[PDB]
Design a protein around this ligand. Structure first.
Ligand SMILES: CCCCCCCCCCCCCCCCS(=O)(=O)O
Ligand SMILES: CCCCCCCCCCCCCCCCS(=O)(=O)O
Lengths: 131, 131
């Protein structure tokens, strides 16, 4: 996934608060998340891909092998089972917890990196540009 | 309540979607409500006060006597018991339904009419100016 490597900064967000609402994130956390304009850092070392999100309030980091299910603790503190695959040039992530699931797709669009999150019909789109 | 009589147009909104979230309003309805910039019309005839809200998508109207509980069907279709009193120069409304309650205060602030809605700690503020 060479096309994803680098540091990216958030440029725009659409329906993010609504997505967090469906996921079950609390008011305060949603408020903190909404003011945060995180920087996404993606790097690859061998068959391990690392995705790091940095914000003044909270940094998250996941390292994984494409196709292998792993444990992830989300920024809003959910302990989920995640699996990320490379499909059609996009990184497709599915998170499962308590009988529920959500999909997060990271894809290239022109010179931007677009992240789409889907939870029960509600879709959020966040656009990033290289920092 | 002579100070409230007239037609008012929405000028600004703060945390309205979050308030609707706490009240239990669905995604689609919240989306329609968020694009609506309603006009509030207040009039008094004898001891009956009428508050009418007009929008391209939905008009609501309630007529009541201050201090007497009455039935109200909200824009989001909840059938509630409402009671409105005049306290400290402000119209204070309490809506009760299914063991829950929310308070809506309509007050004058300078030349504006301010509406504050509170639901479980979440507070929304909407400012109106004369049309
Ligand atoms: C108290 C600190 C709060 C920090 C933010 C917390 C956010 C909690 C909700 C996270 C939902 C999942 C986000 C997936 C990546 C979206 S994207 O950002 O990668 O595009
Ligand atoms: C499909 C049509 C949708 C129309 C809008 C529906 C809104 C539903 C939620 C209403 C919550 C209560 C609003 C109190 C007055 C707020 S204020 O507006 O008077 O300031």
């Amino acid at each position: 996934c060479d096309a994803f490597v680098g540091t990216w900064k958030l440029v725009s967000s659409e329906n993010f608060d609504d997505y967090m609402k469906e996921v079950g994130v609390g008011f305060a956390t949603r408020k903190v998340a909404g003011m945060a304009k995180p920087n996404m850092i993606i790097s690859v070392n061998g068959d391990l891909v690392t995705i790091r999100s940095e914000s003044t309030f909270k940094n998250t980091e996941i390292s994984f092998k494409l196709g292998v299910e792993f444990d992830e603790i989300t920024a809003d503190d959910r302990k989920v089972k995640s699996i990320i695959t490379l499909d059609g040039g996009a990184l497709v992530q599915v998170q499962k917890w308590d009988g529920k699931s959500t999909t997060i797709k990271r894809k290239r669009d022109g010179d931007k990196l677009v992240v789409e999150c889907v939870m029960k019909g509600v879709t959020s789109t966040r656009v990033y540009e290289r920092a």
